[PDB]
Amino acid sequence: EVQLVESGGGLVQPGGSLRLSCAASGFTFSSYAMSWVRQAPGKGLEWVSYISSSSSYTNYADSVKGRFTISRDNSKNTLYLQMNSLRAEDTASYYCARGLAGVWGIDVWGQGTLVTVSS
Amino acid sequence: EGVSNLVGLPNNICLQKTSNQILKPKLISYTLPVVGQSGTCITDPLLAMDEGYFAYSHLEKIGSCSRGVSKQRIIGVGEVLDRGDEVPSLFMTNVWTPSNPNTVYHCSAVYNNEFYYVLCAVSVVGDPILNSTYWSGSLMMTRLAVKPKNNGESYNQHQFALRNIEKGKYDKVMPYGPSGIKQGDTLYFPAVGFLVRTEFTYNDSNCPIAECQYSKPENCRLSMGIRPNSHYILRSGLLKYNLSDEENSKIVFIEISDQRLSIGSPSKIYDSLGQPVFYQASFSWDTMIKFGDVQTVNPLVVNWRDNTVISRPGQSQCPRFNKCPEVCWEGVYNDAFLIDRINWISAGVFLDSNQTAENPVFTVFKDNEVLYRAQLASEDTNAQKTITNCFLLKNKIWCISLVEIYDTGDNVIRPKLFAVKIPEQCT
Ligand SMILES: *[C@@H]1O[C@H](CO)[C@@H](O[C@@H]2O[C@H](CO)[C@@H](O[C@@H]3O[C@H](CO[C@H]4O[C@H](CO[C@H]5O[C@H](CO)[C@@H](O)[C@H](O)[C@@H]5O)[C@@H](O)[C@H](O)[C@@H]4O)[C@@H](O)[C@H](O[C@H]4O[C@H](CO)[C@@H](O)[C@H](O)[C@@H]4O)[C@@H]3O)[C@H](O)[C@H]2NC(C)=O)[C@H](O)[C@H]1NC(C)=O
Ligand SMILES: *[C@@H]1O[C@H](CO)[C@@H](O[C@@H]2O[C@H](CO)[C@@H](O[C@@H]3O[C@H](CO[C@H]4O[C@H](CO)[C@@H](O)[C@H](O)[C@@H]4O)[C@@H](O)[C@H](O[C@H]4O[C@H](CO)[C@@H](O)[C@H](O)[C@@H]4O)[C@@H]3O)[C@H](O)[C@H]2NC(C)=O)[C@H](O)[C@H]1NC(C)=O
Ligand SMILES: *[C@@H]1O[C@H](CO)[C@@H](O[C@@H]2O[C@H](CO)[C@@H](O[C@@H]3O[C@H](CO[C@H]4O[C@H](CO[C@H]5O[C@H](CO)[C@@H](O)[C@H](O)[C@@H]5O)[C@@H](O)[C@H](O)[C@@H]4O)[C@@H](O)[C@H](O)[C@@H]3O)[C@H](O)[C@H]2NC(C)=O)[C@H](O)[C@H]1NC(C)=O
Ligand SMILES: *[C@@H]1O[C@H](CO)[C@@H](O[C@@H]2O[C@H](CO)[C@@H](O[C@@H]3O[C@H](CO[C@H]4O[C@H](CO)[C@@H](O)[C@H](O)[C@@H]4O)[C@@H](O)[C@H](O)[C@@H]3O)[C@H](O)[C@H]2NC(C)=O)[C@H](O)[C@H]1NC(C)=O
Ligand SMILES: *[C@@H]1O[C@H](CO)[C@@H](O[C@@H]2O[C@H](CO)[C@@H](O[C@@H]3O[C@H](CO[C@H]4O[C@H](CO)[C@@H](O)[C@H](O)[C@@H]4O)[C@@H](O)[C@H](O)[C@@H]3O)[C@H](O)[C@H]2NC(C)=O)[C@H](O)[C@H]1NC(C)=O
To answer: Where are the alpha helices (DSSP H) in A1-119?
Structure first.
């Protein structure tokens, strides 16, 4: 069974810099695609990033085009996200999946991680 | 390894009739909880599959699921790979969303060398088939690559307005259907026509009134329009787009034959074992399924099938299993895919109800009976539109079907996609 283990906390000052990690086990991480997705209470899904298998193609969203950059550590299964200069409109729970945005997902969302940006 | 279309010699599927449920559906549309629910609504699905690359489209409405507003339309393509436990799924690789959501209507997808053309209709008067008396007729093509690259700006997304239209005698053309086929260097899209009622040449004596005592002669002619006193009669067909020139956007409408002429409905044309198969929804008096393999594309003539067991439900005026002409425009889109040609076996998700739209049940029908069936949800779960496509996984046939069902803890009819494996044994 595919297990997604989210990490990273919240309650950061506006304009700070947080790092959200998400490791996984089961499927072979060496050849697949990863994408961060977030959702605030009141809204639906919205893709945050995207990355290819060999760390070749990287895509983002129009609201976070220059905020952060996704990475890949195929040696030791992990998925980092070096958020920089966040705003109040970024307070939402982030998740990790195997599809860019879609309505898809090939594994039950495990725990998720909340990031609070206020005061 | 990989995923290829129905070619070669696949594994032998079961052929006899049995009640033992040898079908094991698997949901591949795991969505996160929607805690903090609202009046959301998703409608107008789309699902195309060819050579291991898929597409998807949906319109999210806030409020009533029919007379609502538009917020976002997610149109994206992606690959078809294995999740790892020998189970195929649809991985997304690119997503496109238009700026103004209340512009795009009635999209249609197709596959090419290394792209995925999505032909949609642009309208500023609302839904076209409901307000066709004032539609302009502009059509926009959207190209989305199945493998984006870094900083292309011209390879991951490219749009262009279709200028030249080769409309023979109609007034407006519009893409109408989930997907189409490829023929090397030519693209074909399912569509419908808009011909004037007064300029219609159809003798009112070919109506099948053999045993229809409680009917009228002109029911065949009146059923060709959305309303009795309508201003346009629909006509199914195909749109040809010869992209091997690119000198000018060409729109060639290929009208369907007169054999079993029904009202315009969302049609689908797909390839299966070399020969292209055609489907047409039943939104008219003829409630039975309209299957058929195409022998001639340029002049569209399909060899229909006389299936008398699979149909779609409707209202009281034209319920299921109705075989007599009656003035009505109603039904639900439920297609199927040809999984074998030696025995002519098909498979698709159809509704099992007399005058309701509930109980979506997966079923496999050969020509005049059902071999093996399997339900997807309870006998009360609602369903409106179903799209079925089949492929291979390295030795065997797999079929992923998009079936809009009513989730329990969602209170909204979300399009959920399943995954059914056709077994290699009977019971
Ligand atoms: C299928 O497509 C057709 C397109 O052919 C659609 O029909 C079109 O509908 C639009 C609607 O905007 C028409 O445009 C104009 O509509 C105006 C409506 O007036 C207001 O209505 C609402 C009510 O609010 C006002 O109420 C009273 C009314 O007197 C006011 O006193 C009050 O102060 C409020 O302001 C408002 O919410 C709305 O915003 C409008 O402001 C018409 O007033 C307007 O008339 C002009 O054009 C006439 C010629 O058509 C002309 O004779 C008038 O003098 C005036 O200049 C205008 O019609 C389109 O006209 C109409 N098309 C056609 C061909 O008539 C149709 O709705 C669509 N159907 C579906 C199901 O999609
Ligand atoms: C749209 O579709 C309708 C229905 O099919 C067509 O109308 C029918 O046309 C056929 C002919 O193809 C009619 O069948 C017979 O017509 C004969 C016509 O009489 C004269 O016509 C020719 C010229 O065409 C003369 O040269 C010749 O002298 C004929 O005498 C009738 O005489 C026949 O009558 C027989 O049947 C009637 C019952 O209807 C019996 O009472 C008689 O005793 C006799 O046995 C025969 O009817 C047919 O009748 C037409 N139907 C109707 C309802 O009138 C249309 O033609 C078609 N539209 C177009 C543009 O072609
Ligand atoms: C979509 O749009 C594309 C265009 O982009 C269409 O493709 C065109 O298809 C036509 C088919 O008629 C092609 O026309 C062909 O031209 C050939 C010329 O090539 C060489 O011909 C000579 C060879 O001798 C020929 O002699 C006679 C002449 O009639 C033939 O009968 C013989 O069989 C020999 O082939 C050479 O001397 C000459 O120098 C040329 O090198 C010709 O030979 C073919 O008979 C035919 O007429 C056209 O070339 C295609 N265009 C492209 C760009 O490939 C396609 O059909 C469209 N699809 C639709 C409409 O569905
Ligand atoms: C409906 O069709 C199904 C098609 O797969 C049927 O399943 C098959 O049923 C037959 C007959 O019962 C089984 O054959 C027997 O299997 C048993 C048990 O096999 C298991 O053995 C170990 C446990 O000891 C287990 O770890 C394995 O994974 C096996 O599952 C054997 O002991 C017998 O000798 C004999 O081979 C098939 O095994 C079974 N298919 C599968 C994939 O297991 C089903 O029975 C049909 N139902 C009805 C009502 O007809
Ligand atoms: C779902 O749709 C099915 C197909 O449309 C329905 O089956 C149909 O049900 C109707 C309603 O009964 C049948 O229509 C009539 O049936 C009666 C039979 O009762 C009398 O018949 C004999 C012989 O005439 C008579 O002597 C006795 O007194 C009986 O009381 C008759 O009036 C007619 O013969 C006529 O057939 C259809 O025949 C039947 N069709 C089929 C293919 O079964 C089904 O009922 C629907 N279900 C629901 C829940 O709506």
So the answer is: none
